[PDB]
């Protein structure tokens, strides 16, 4: 006889839908005789414990501008937005959990992990000290989602997902704090818990803010409070630290009140122009923040010094909008890889034709360079040409074998050695801002990152004057200027990336196609609930019970 919790864990992790599980249950019962599995109603009853809105909790001091009820689950994401014909038209569907309810559900899920960590850390068990929780929030817009038929608004064909994950939990003991919980796979799909799923265009600022405002309000309300939760027979308190890193460049620019991606001020961490970045490229410092952006927007709106458009833009450093989401300045490792590898692809394309001797070239010649590069890349590294470049392509193109293959087409040897040494420098610099812990497994690489960055900058500025004279990519600027400072500030780059958010994005389509009701008014509720169940950690150790 199997328990309903075990049956639910199997049905969730083995990616089985309700209908398939029901027919498996009926055939197993009819053939074996005795009832091995459990009925769908039993599984449904056994899953309400894990969903948020079942466990009692009490905030102290009470959170501002939010209800104190502790029995709220899936609620409308529109948050009572006016849908009348006299108002701004709404065309979005959104279902969301309350932030505090989701966090208390996650904490009660990780209860036994926390207890095991306290036991293994040589501390006591019934300690109720001020537990500190570090939560990473990641957002990402999606495309190519097909709207369904049926009644409802003119929903767009794009989706935006908001998710959070729990990285570190600490408790204070004496004069120091111990490190009681760690996520073994911070970039996995099993850790990013969905929080709010909406079907809105990422560029539609009106509805984006309309749906994301209550979440930010709750975040600011609970940023300065204490949460008392009944945990294993002893009430324990919880503090929260919020870090938003899983935002790509476009989201950071849009939600931080910055300009578009091209612009002149390229970096989201320092207020330096593109020309100044191409002139120095090494020595910089992080200077942007949410409060600074708010003050700069206030200055832009007020115009207290009576300046023109260009002078006001120079004073405000490009902040022409009011930020509404607080994001910590950092670098997204996945998109950094994609951008750097695409730039390397263009470098190879230019180096095939020797642009350093032929400054003028035609579209046909560049297309022929594209064709020969694609042919030889396929021939050697077994890579097919792709119009929009992925991350596996970046990893397989960030090797010495592919640069040797490209050098098999470059007649000159100076270009061969230049590309070889530049590629070696890039491969030496990469493991610093990609490893989940770069102070332990790559100490020499972390120490030599600065020298390697200086060498890379000098090599670009000297040997590649036809590509990086007066202009350089913002991702190269970030990689060559800000990585060591971010390492010192945080502890790791890559553990805070958006790889887990991308994996959850992959899971979103599968859930929408297989484990959700095919209706425009319930699909996102079902997807959110199933994704929460899948990301729950109480249902994952039941599949790892064979190691006990």
């Amino acid at each position: 006889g199997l328990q309903p919790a075990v049956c639910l864990a199997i049905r969730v992790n083995t990616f089985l839908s309700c209908s398939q599980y029901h027919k498996m249950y009926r055939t197993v019962k009819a053939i074996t005789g005795r009832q091995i599995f459990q009925p769908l109603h039993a599984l449904r009853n056994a899953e309400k414990v894990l969903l948020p809105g079942y466990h009692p909790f009490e905030w102290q001091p009470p959170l501002k501008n939010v209800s104190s009820r502790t029995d709220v689950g899936i609620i409308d994401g529109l948050s009572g937005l006016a849908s009348s014909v006299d108002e701004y038209p709404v065309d979005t569907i959104a279902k969301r959990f309350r932030y505090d309810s989701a966090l208390v559900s996650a904490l009660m899920d990780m209860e036994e992990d926390i207890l095991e960590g306290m036991r293994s850390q040589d501390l006591d068990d019934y300690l109720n000290g001020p537990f500190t929780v570090v939560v990473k929030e990641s957002c990402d817009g999606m495309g190519d989602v097909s709207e369904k038929h049926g009644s409802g608004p003119a929903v767009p064909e794009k989706a935006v997902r908001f998710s959070f994950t729990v990285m570190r939990i600490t408790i204070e003991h004496g004069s120091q704090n111990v490190k009681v919980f760690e996520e073994p796979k911070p970039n996995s799909e099993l850790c990013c818990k969905p929080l709010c799923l909406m079907l809105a265009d990422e560029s539609d600022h009106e509805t984006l803010t309309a749906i994301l405002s209550p979440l930010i309000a709750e975040r600011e309300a609970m940023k300065s409070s204490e949460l008392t939760l009944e945990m294993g027979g002893i009430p324990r308190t919880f503090k929260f630290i919020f870090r938003g890193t899983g935002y790509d460049e476009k989201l950071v620019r849009e939600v931080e009140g910055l300009e578009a991606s091209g612009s002149v001020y390229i970096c989201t961490l320092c207020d330096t122009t593109r020309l100044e970045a191409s002139q120095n490229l090494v020595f910089h410092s992080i200077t942007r923040s949410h409060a600074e952006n708010l003050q700069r927007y206030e200055v832009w709106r007020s115009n207290p010094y009576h300046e023109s458009v260009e002078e006001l833009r120079d004073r405000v450093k490009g902040v022409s909008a009011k930020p509404f989401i607080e994001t910590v300045p950092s670098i997204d490792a996945l998109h950094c890889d994609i951008g750097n590898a695409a730039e390397f692809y263009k470098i190879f394309q230019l180096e095939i034709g020797e642009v350093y001797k032929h400054p003028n070239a035609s579209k046909e010649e560049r297309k022929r360079w594209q064709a020969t590069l694609d042919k030889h890349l396929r021939k050697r590294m077994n890579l097919k040409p792709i119009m929009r470049m992925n991350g596996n392509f970046a990893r397989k193109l960030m090797t010495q074998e592919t640069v040797d293959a490209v050098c098999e087409l470059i007649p000159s040897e100076e270009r061969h050695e230049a590309l070889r040494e530049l590629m070696d420098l890039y491969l030496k610099m990469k493991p610093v801002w990609r490893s989940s812990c770069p102070a332990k497994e790559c100490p020499e690489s972390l120490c030599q990152y600065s020298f390697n960055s200086q060498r890379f900058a000098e090599l670009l500025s000297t040997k590649f004057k036809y590509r990086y004279e007066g202009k350089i990519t913002n991702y190269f600027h970030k990689t060559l200027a800000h990585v060591p400072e971010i390492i010192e500030r945080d502890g790791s780059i890559g553990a805070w990336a958006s790889e887990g958010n991308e994996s959850g994005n992959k899971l979103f389509r599968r859930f929408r196609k297989m484990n959700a009701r095919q209706s425009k008014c319930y699909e996102m509720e079902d997807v959110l609930k199933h994704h929460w169940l899948y990301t729950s950690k109480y249902l994952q150790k039941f599949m790892n019970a064979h190691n006990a």
Partner: protein, 344 residues
């Protein structure tokens, strides 16, 4: 009553419901774009120009002493008479209400070039709470000009706001506010004849009276067919306000007003019920101490307009209204909205 279609340039995705059209010396401008101001036009105002039924939204620069203002979504627009333009309230792209008054005027003009001057005005006293959808007019009583303000829609108070109902709105109180532009002072008044809230109404001004009619009250989810006349005098002491209820009003919300002839206006567009949409135009004739609303001929609406659910528009000033109809393409980009022009 002539209806024609106007084409668009490459800025079609910049017009949303709730925009405002700004007139100076026969030239109409644009305000209330989509999203935060871009680098193509940091000011946010645009040169709304029509030649041979074609739209070209050219940018319009601001003065050195001007204040760059956010794109408001539902403000209160007035045309003070040395010609300036008063806007108060609205919604920012981040969906926060604003309680600030911006004053716009033409600072300097060149050959087909206009430079505006936006001035920030601060109000003291009984300042109205932030809101949108309301109306503002100006009255001239014995040589003194003062602005009148009426209620609209606003978010719930800070002590009764819950993130579950964060975006829920409630009608403002019917208190009438008299704001003085040259002094930046406001005095609130309570009128017994005004009991329910009112929003998305149309305001008609005269020498010393304001005619408010139509509008939607969210408390009862009804559109009353009322017609109120508000009279203001300016003695040496405090101003006195009297409101009188008059019969013969119409029941319409979010309608469009334009002036065809002196002492003559017309109501075009609006809503009758939640799903009912205003197909008739009421010709209002003004007088010294009398009001008279009459129904004129219905313009030849097209199938797209007749079978739609929403239109939005503003006033050109020269007896023309610029209304738009949403399209069903959306995903195919470009033609997200279908625009029309109406001649009175």
């Amino acid at each position: 009553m002539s209806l024609q279609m106007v084409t668009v340039g490459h800025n079609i995705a910049l017009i949303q419901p709730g925009f405002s059209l700004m007139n100076f010396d026969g030239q109409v401008f644009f305000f209330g774009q989509k999203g935060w101001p871009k680098r193509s036009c940091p000011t946010g105002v645009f040169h709304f120009d029509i030649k041979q039924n074609h739209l070209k939204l050219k940018p319009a620069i601001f003065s050195k002493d001007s204040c760059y203002l956010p794109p408001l979504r539902y403000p209160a627009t007035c045309s003070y008479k040395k010609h300036q333009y008063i806007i108060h309230g609205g919604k920012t792209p981040n969906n926060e209400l604003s309680d600030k008054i911006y004053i716009m005027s033409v600072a300097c003009k060149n050959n087909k070039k206009v430079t505006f001057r936006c001035t920030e005005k601060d109000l003291v006293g009984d300042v109205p709470e932030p809101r949108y959808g309301h109306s503002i007019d100006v009255v001239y009583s014995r040589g003194k000009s003062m602005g009148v303000l009426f209620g609209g829609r606003s978010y719930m108070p800070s002590t009764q706001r819950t993130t579950e109902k964060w975006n829920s709105v409630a009608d403002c109180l019917p208190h009438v506010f008299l704001i003085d532009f040259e002094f930046g002072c406001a005095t609130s008044y309570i009128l017994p004849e005004l009991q329910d809230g009112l929003s998305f109404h149309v305001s008609i001004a005269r020498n010393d009276t304001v005619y408010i009619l139509g509008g939607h009250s969210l408390a009862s989810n009804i559109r009353p067919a009322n017609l109120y006349r508000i009279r203001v005098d300016l003695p040496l002491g405090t101003p006195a306000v009297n409101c009188t209820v008059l019969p013969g009003g119409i029941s319409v919300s979010s309608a469009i007003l334009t002036q065809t002839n002196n002492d003559e206006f017309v109501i075009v567009g609006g809503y009758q019920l939640e799903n009912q949409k205003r197909m008739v135009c009421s010709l209002v004739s003004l007088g010294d101490n009398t009001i008279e609303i009459s129904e004129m001929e219905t313009p030849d609406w097209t199938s797209d307009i007749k079978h739609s659910k929403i239109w939005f528009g503003s006033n050109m000033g020269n007896g023309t209204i610029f209304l738009g109809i949403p399209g069903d393409n959306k995903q195919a980009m470009s033609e997200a909205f279908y625009f029309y022009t109406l001649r009175c």
